[PDB]
Design a protein around this ligand. Structure first.
Ligand SMILES: CO[C@@]1(C(=O)Nc2cncc3ccccc23)CCOc2c(F)cc(F)cc21
Ligand SMILES: CO[C@@]1(C(=O)Nc2cncc3ccccc23)CCOc2c(F)cc(F)cc21
Lengths: 296, 300
């Protein structure tokens, strides 16, 4: 029993964290094989990069200095070719994730991991992370069997305290730029499929007070959801919740009527899984994984 | 900016997780140097679980009864001894991934990261606190026994917890790494119940300071209180008494934000009386008590 916000074991990623210094800026890099990836703002980025030489980038893997033998830019990520292939390089992939998808963040400072937390890519493409100055280059990942899927690299903090970054190919999530200018996160919405997954996790854990006898059409649910700034629920989401619906005996549209009532009436002093708000940072796969004990 | 529940990087602990099998039972062990530590109930059957004589059961076992697996490699057990509720299986190979470590016993309110494992394989990492009633509100399935709680200070892993059991309410009980249980619990299937839980007051105050540092100030008020008046109000809401030690510990956060501890106590009293009124503090509609003053300063 129990339900916790749980991150993937960070070990495979800790072995890849390095410190990258260029001039006055020190941030984190991800060392995979003989390439170190980091935010390009460490340095007109094409013009600034041409002016740099390999010896301007100081890369430190623990107490060892790596020698940079090349540099190139891919979108908003800088790739520093190094002379040594990382012996701790895990099986990995670069994947771009969708809003609503969750991942673990290994927060680093000076190439040293300090914390690991779980979070979701918000529908407005920001992450509600925990990052201080020097965290840039910290990465988000998932682990599938023995394979690390890198999905995020931290670049900046928006004026509201939320965070923006790119996939490992340097493409920003959202309409953000890595330049000093006025940027604002759009109005956020609740990840509906994740709230439903979390309501299924609550039922599995014995918390059933919110369940009702009613069901709803997908269209009627979406009309209500739209009013409360909730993301539309698609037939794909209904299909993905299928296994949890089968396990608990609560059809997805049945759980949708519970969510509809929860929105129109509140919790009335009650909590679900120790929370007074509807949690939207557990995907349906996260719920199945935690309420089944899948290991990595 | 931002405030998250944050666990320590689990890598140093993942390199210590092993699978320990004795008879039909399979749980997790912690391999440090040439010793594997695990819950002593691994020697039990369902028939022993109610009133087990662990000294008697252990004397009947031999080194070849314990099957230890580190990844795809079987370790050979060359000795076994029991220290309180932990079994120590001496092995022939020292773990090359053994980090700098210490065994520390923690006090209620203290937080730590848990590396949840099944069959000697880590599946997740989460943060939690030792509740005032000595239980942890973990996320553990059958097979998670032997999963450990830890903190990391600079390069040293302080092991503070090893999971042993789930109480009938879904909360969890375990020991420090010397086998001493936290709380009045025993590793028997006899009727056991967690005492009524209470809120870790010093942790809530630390979290209210974290909210002020992050720009949240709506809950602040013009009032101050005596420590005794705060404790009389606190107790009525099942909040732990706040000691002068707690007031002293909150000193640095009080200095950083310019709000005196008894001033923040008066804000907490108001929050307990009124609730949040549709508002949130650091994205939460409840008062968070699993961030210590040390965690708040660390993260901020
Ligand atoms: C140094 O990178 C910046 C930044 O956001 N950094 C941060 C990223 N995370 C957490 C932070 C917590 C506190 C302080 C800064 C944080 C600040 C300057 O403006 C910019 C900028 F125009 C573009 C850019 F891609 C980054 C940055
Ligand atoms: C080792 O088995 C026990 C156990 O609690 N295990 C578990 C630990 N965590 C999560 C669990 C989730 C679901 C099922 C069991 C869980 C159950 C039987 O009674 C006992 C017992 F008397 C003493 C003991 F120290 C352990 C155990």
């Amino acid at each position: 029993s129990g339900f916790r916000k749980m991150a993937f074991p960070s070990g495979k990623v800790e072995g890849c964290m390095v410190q990258v210094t260029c001039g006055t800026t020190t941030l984190n890099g991800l060392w995979l094989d003989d390439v170190v990836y980091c935010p390009r703002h460490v340095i007109n980025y094409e013009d600034l990069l041409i002016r740099k030489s390999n010896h301007n980038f100081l890369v430190q893997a623990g107490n060892v200095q790596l020698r940079v033998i090349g540099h190139s830019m891919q979108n908003c990520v800088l790739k520093l070719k190094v002379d040594t292939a990382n012996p701790k390089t895990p099986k990995y992939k670069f994947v771009r994730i969708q809003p609503g998808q969750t991942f673990s963040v290994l927060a680093c400072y000076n190439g040293s991991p300090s914390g690991v937390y779980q979070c979701a890519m918000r529908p407005n493409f920001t992450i509600k992370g925990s990052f201080l100055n020097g965290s840039c280059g910290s990465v988000g990942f998932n682990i599938d069997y023995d394979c690390v899927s890198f999905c995020y690299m931290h670049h900046m903090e928006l004026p509201t305290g939320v965070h923006a970054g790119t996939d490992l190919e340097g493409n920003f999530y959202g309409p953000f730029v890595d330049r000093q200018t006025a940027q604002a996160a759009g109005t956020d919405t609740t990840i509906t499929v994740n709230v439903l997954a979390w309501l299924y996790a609550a039922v599995i854990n014995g918390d059933r007070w919110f369940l009702n006898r009613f069901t709803t059409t997908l269209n009627d649910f979406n009309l209500v959801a739209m009013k409360y700034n909730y993301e539309p629920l698609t037939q794909d989401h209904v299909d993905i919740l299928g296994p949890l619906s089968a396990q608990t005996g609560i059809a997805v549209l049945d759980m949708c009527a519970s969510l509809k009532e929860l929105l129109q009436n509140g919790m009335n002093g009650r909590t679900i899984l120790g929370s007074a708000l509807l949690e939207d940072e557990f995907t349906p796969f996260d719920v199945v994984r935690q309420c089944s004990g899948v290991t990595f």
